[PDB]
Symmetry: C5
Subunit: 114 residues, 5 copies
Amino acid sequence: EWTGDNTNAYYSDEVISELHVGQIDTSPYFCIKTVKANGSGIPVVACAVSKQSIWAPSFKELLDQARYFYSTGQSVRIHVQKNIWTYPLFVNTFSANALVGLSSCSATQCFGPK
Amino acid sequence: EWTGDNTNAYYSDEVISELHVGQIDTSPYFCIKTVKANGSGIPVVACAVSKQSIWAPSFKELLDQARYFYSTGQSVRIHVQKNIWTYPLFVNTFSANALVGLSSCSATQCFGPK
Amino acid sequence: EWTGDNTNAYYSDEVISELHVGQIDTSPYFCIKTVKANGSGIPVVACAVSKQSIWAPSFKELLDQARYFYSTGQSVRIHVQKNIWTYPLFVNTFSANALVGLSSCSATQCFGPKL
Amino acid sequence: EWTGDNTNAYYSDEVISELHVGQIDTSPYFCIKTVKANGSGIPVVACAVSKQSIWAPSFKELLDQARYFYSTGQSVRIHVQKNIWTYPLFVNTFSANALVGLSSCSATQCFGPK
Amino acid sequence: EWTGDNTNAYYSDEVISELHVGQIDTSPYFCIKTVKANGSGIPVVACAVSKQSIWAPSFKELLDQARYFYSTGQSVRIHVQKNIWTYPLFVNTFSANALVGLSSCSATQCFGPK
Ligand SMILES: CC(=O)N[C@@H]1[C@@H](O)[C@H](O[C@@H]2O[C@H](CO)[C@H](O)[C@H](O[C@]3(C(=O)O)C[C@H](O)[C@@H](NC(C)=O)[C@H]([C@H](O)[C@H](O)CO)O3)[C@H]2O)[C@@H](CO)O[C@H]1O
Ligand SMILES: CC(=O)N[C@@H]1[C@@H](O)[C@H](O[C@@H]2O[C@H](CO)[C@H](O)[C@H](O[C@]3(C(=O)O)C[C@H](O)[C@@H](NC(C)=O)[C@H]([C@H](O)[C@H](O)CO)O3)[C@H]2O)[C@@H](CO)O[C@H]1O
Ligand SMILES: CC(=O)N[C@@H]1[C@@H](O)[C@H](O[C@@H]2O[C@H](CO)[C@H](O)[C@H](O[C@]3(C(=O)O)C[C@H](O)[C@@H](NC(C)=O)[C@H]([C@H](O)[C@H](O)CO)O3)[C@H]2O)[C@@H](CO)O[C@H]1O
């Protein structure tokens, strides 16, 4: 598996605008929300769950990087894999997207797979 | 179990006004005080105890995130489980609430379960 | 044991003015110096030593919190247990106080145990 | 082995301009892009992959340090070992370079091996 | 052994002016250069190596603390033990000093052993 696989999805020129942390089924987790820097479109919601999904190993790295980008407000590309989380109240609160990568963007390009 | 279970309680549009770290019965713990951003109402007090309860795996994640929202003074929703801690002077000094989650509320609604 | 046991000691409305990191007898340790915000009294010194004393599990947490409070310079309540470290040159330079807790304070009250 | 081995390569007076985090084959990884501080030259790209290559022990240290130098935009020397990652798509997106060290540079000199 | 031992050396009112991180013989390491805050004297260079010397257990604490004092530019007392590192090319790039302590200072008074 790889962040860059074309079976994942991504959204460029987004800014992390909200951040949540909690626990589910003994697993710490966090979710983020991103919105287009230019105000268009609809928000992206993704979560990482510390001991769930193939993406479990990068939980801490993605949490630290999400916090960094959240506090700077900079434009990023968010990479997710859709339809991973299944608990209905959780999905309805947040989404089913697993968070699989974050890429800083310049005004012209984003530094990550495309 | 989940931060968002309806057996837990939450308070929206709060700010983290105080933070304390200590140790009890060989376990690191922290507690936070929150108050409504607009000044109304009464404070909320909650603690996490590193080695205790089903919420123990989330101790570090919650301490890190509590420190961040405390340093910004931004609006948050705090999620708690009532009536778990037992040592009477600890309960009386702080509370029996376990901290089970923290959501940012930078928008109309808080980014978390309700 | 508990940070708030009345056999421990505490000092309210203190500013963490200095911070030191070193190693003693295989253990990383740190010490802080604190002074009353209002300028009165004498400094308090206290140290935490990794894997030594009953307070060892809280070492990393205390160091991170002490760093944060040092960087802001805000008024805090410092909680210690007296007469813990016995290395005589170490005590002479710093003290025998084990750091056991740190509480933020508003101008009117500190968020931590008293008595 | 050593960062400073002459079989490694290094580029002086660079700025870390972009940062990416993701996961590959169970390994969280990060990549950085750097450019000459004066605006000349061609970018350098390098990645560190957790639990992969002889450089795995230093993964967290290099991630923390690259985050710091990325946040200050200060001039640095980046040290790499070439032709380490073999996944062709990954190499094509990023580089085959393993990141092996980072040195601050003054106006006069870089504080590291040459 | 103690940071404050007779047989160690120290240099007061110094500013961390450079920082480097790398790896050697499977061990991550970092080095710092310091200069007198008032501009006098000759630089000091010291390194810490995670799996080596009797000071190995304090590697992470000293790295974190060096980073913090580096980022603020404030005046410190640096404590070293001479003649520790042995790989000649390493000593030639940096020095043989093992880093063994950091003490903050104020107006020509440092909080550490003298
Ligand atoms: C920017 C915007 O909201 N709307 C359109 C825009 O769709 C369109 O071109 C876009 O230009 C941006 C600049 O980086 C991107 O290149 C868009 O491609 C991607 C993206 O990177 O965001 C690629 C990606 O595969 C898509 N993801 C999915 C699941 O389909 C996303 C996604 O559709 C959007 O990001 C969601 O808003 O788009 C690229 O489409 C230009 C017309 O050229 O006009 C803007 O206003
Ligand atoms: C509710 C509304 O649409 N408009 C206002 C509103 O400003 C306010 O009501 C409170 O506003 C917030 C909106 O962010 C919440 O909806 C409050 O409900 C909760 C809360 O989220 O804080 C729900 C939660 O279940 C409750 N917890 C418990 C244990 O009961 C808390 C709690 O009761 C209070 O937070 C304690 O202060 O409230 C909602 O009450 C009021 C202000 O008077 O006026 C509406 O018109
Ligand atoms: C007025 C002006 O800017 N002239 C530059 C000229 O200075 C520059 O030469 C480079 O000068 C810097 C000074 O720090 C270095 O000494 C360069 O040497 C190295 C480097 O440290 O970057 C050595 C290194 O071994 C080389 N790496 C490899 C794999 O060979 C690199 C590498 O060639 C360059 O960094 C790539 O740009 O150079 C020294 O080359 C040159 C190039 O920057 O351009 C003039 O305009």
